[PDB]
Amino acid sequence: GAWKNFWSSLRKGFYDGEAGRAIRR
């Protein structure tokens, strides 16, 4: 058991703004 926390650990960075900033939309 760990992949679960690893999954959310990823979005943790996208929530900062990369979710859109990196999209250059």
PDB file of N, CA and C in Angstrom:
ATOM      1  N   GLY A   1       0.805  -1.206   0.000  1.00  0.00           N
ATOM      2  CA  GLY A   1       0.000   0.000   0.000  1.00  0.00           C
ATOM      3  C   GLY A   1       0.842   1.261   0.000  1.00  0.00           C
ATOM      4  N   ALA A   2       0.719   2.053  -1.060  1.00  0.00           N
ATOM      5  CA  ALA A   2       1.475   3.293  -1.178  1.00  0.00           C
ATOM      6  C   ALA A   2       1.121   4.032  -2.464  1.00  0.00           C
ATOM      7  N   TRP A   3       0.848   3.273  -3.520  1.00  0.00           N
ATOM      8  CA  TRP A   3       0.497   3.857  -4.810  1.00  0.00           C
ATOM      9  C   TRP A   3      -0.627   4.876  -4.657  1.00  0.00           C
ATOM     10  N   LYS A   4      -1.529   4.620  -3.716  1.00  0.00           N
ATOM     11  CA  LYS A   4      -2.652   5.516  -3.468  1.00  0.00           C
ATOM     12  C   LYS A   4      -2.164   6.928  -3.164  1.00  0.00           C
ATOM     13  N   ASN A   5      -1.268   7.044  -2.190  1.00  0.00           N
ATOM     14  CA  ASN A   5      -0.721   8.339  -1.803  1.00  0.00           C
ATOM     15  C   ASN A   5       0.143   8.920  -2.919  1.00  0.00           C
ATOM     16  N   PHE A   6       0.728   8.041  -3.725  1.00  0.00           N
ATOM     17  CA  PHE A   6       1.580   8.467  -4.830  1.00  0.00           C
ATOM     18  C   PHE A   6       0.753   9.125  -5.930  1.00  0.00           C
ATOM     19  N   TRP A   7      -0.480   8.662  -6.092  1.00  0.00           N
ATOM     20  CA  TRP A   7      -1.373   9.205  -7.109  1.00  0.00           C
ATOM     21  C   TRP A   7      -1.706  10.665  -6.820  1.00  0.00           C
ATOM     22  N   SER A   8      -2.192  10.927  -5.611  1.00  0.00           N
ATOM     23  CA  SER A   8      -2.552  12.282  -5.209  1.00  0.00           C
ATOM     24  C   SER A   8      -1.314  13.167  -5.108  1.00  0.00           C
ATOM     25  N   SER A   9      -0.191  12.561  -4.737  1.00  0.00           N
ATOM     26  CA  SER A   9       1.063  13.294  -4.598  1.00  0.00           C
ATOM     27  C   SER A   9       1.430  13.996  -5.901  1.00  0.00           C
ATOM     28  N   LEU A  10       0.904  13.485  -7.009  1.00  0.00           N
ATOM     29  CA  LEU A  10       1.174  14.063  -8.322  1.00  0.00           C
ATOM     30  C   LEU A  10       0.361  15.335  -8.535  1.00  0.00           C
ATOM     31  N   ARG A  11      -0.950  15.232  -8.341  1.00  0.00           N
ATOM     32  CA  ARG A  11      -1.839  16.375  -8.512  1.00  0.00           C
ATOM     33  C   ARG A  11      -1.451  17.510  -7.569  1.00  0.00           C
ATOM     34  N   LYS A  12      -0.781  17.162  -6.476  1.00  0.00           N
ATOM     35  CA  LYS A  12      -0.351  18.151  -5.494  1.00  0.00           C
ATOM     36  C   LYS A  12       0.412  19.288  -6.165  1.00  0.00           C
ATOM     37  N   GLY A  13       1.103  18.968  -7.256  1.00  0.00           N
ATOM     38  CA  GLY A  13       1.864  19.975  -7.973  1.00  0.00           C
ATOM     39  C   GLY A  13       1.040  20.680  -9.032  1.00  0.00           C
ATOM     40  N   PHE A  14       0.076  19.964  -9.603  1.00  0.00           N
ATOM     41  CA  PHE A  14      -0.783  20.528 -10.637  1.00  0.00           C
ATOM     42  C   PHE A  14      -1.762  21.536 -10.041  1.00  0.00           C
ATOM     43  N   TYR A  15      -2.099  21.343  -8.770  1.00  0.00           N
ATOM     44  CA  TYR A  15      -3.028  22.232  -8.083  1.00  0.00           C
ATOM     45  C   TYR A  15      -2.401  23.605  -7.856  1.00  0.00           C
ATOM     46  N   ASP A  16      -1.075  23.636  -7.776  1.00  0.00           N
ATOM     47  CA  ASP A  16      -0.352  24.883  -7.562  1.00  0.00           C
ATOM     48  C   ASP A  16      -0.590  25.855  -8.714  1.00  0.00           C
ATOM     49  N   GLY A  17      -0.905  25.309  -9.886  1.00  0.00           N
ATOM     50  CA  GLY A  17      -1.151  26.142 -11.048  1.00  0.00           C
ATOM     51  C   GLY A  17      -0.690  25.489 -12.337  1.00  0.00           C
ATOM     52  N   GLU A  18       0.210  24.518 -12.217  1.00  0.00           N
ATOM     53  CA  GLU A  18       0.734  23.814 -13.383  1.00  0.00           C
ATOM     54  C   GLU A  18      -0.396  23.176 -14.186  1.00  0.00           C
ATOM     55  N   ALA A  19      -1.512  22.907 -13.515  1.00  0.00           N
ATOM     56  CA  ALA A  19      -2.666  22.299 -14.166  1.00  0.00           C
ATOM     57  C   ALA A  19      -3.116  23.124 -15.367  1.00  0.00           C
ATOM     58  N   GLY A  20      -2.809  24.417 -15.341  1.00  0.00           N
ATOM     59  CA  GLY A  20      -3.191  25.293 -16.433  1.00  0.00           C
ATOM     60  C   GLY A  20      -2.021  26.089 -16.974  1.00  0.00           C
ATOM     61  N   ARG A  21      -1.174  26.579 -16.074  1.00  0.00           N
ATOM     62  CA  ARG A  21      -0.011  27.365 -16.468  1.00  0.00           C
ATOM     63  C   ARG A  21       0.834  26.610 -17.490  1.00  0.00           C
ATOM     64  N   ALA A  22       1.058  25.326 -17.233  1.00  0.00           N
ATOM     65  CA  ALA A  22       1.848  24.493 -18.130  1.00  0.00           C
ATOM     66  C   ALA A  22       1.119  24.260 -19.448  1.00  0.00           C
ATOM     67  N   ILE A  23      -0.199  24.437 -19.429  1.00  0.00           N
ATOM     68  CA  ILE A  23      -1.011  24.246 -20.624  1.00  0.00           C
ATOM     69  C   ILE A  23      -0.839  25.408 -21.598  1.00  0.00           C
ATOM     70  N   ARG A  24      -0.398  26.548 -21.078  1.00  0.00           N
ATOM     71  CA  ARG A  24      -0.191  27.733 -21.901  1.00  0.00           C
ATOM     72  C   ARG A  24      -1.460  28.092 -22.668  1.00  0.00           C
ATOM     73  N   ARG A  25      -2.606  27.691 -22.126  1.00  0.00           N
ATOM     74  CA  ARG A  25      -3.889  27.968 -22.760  1.00  0.00           C
ATOM     75  C   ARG A  25      -4.156  29.469 -22.812  1.00  0.00           C
TER      76      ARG A  25
END
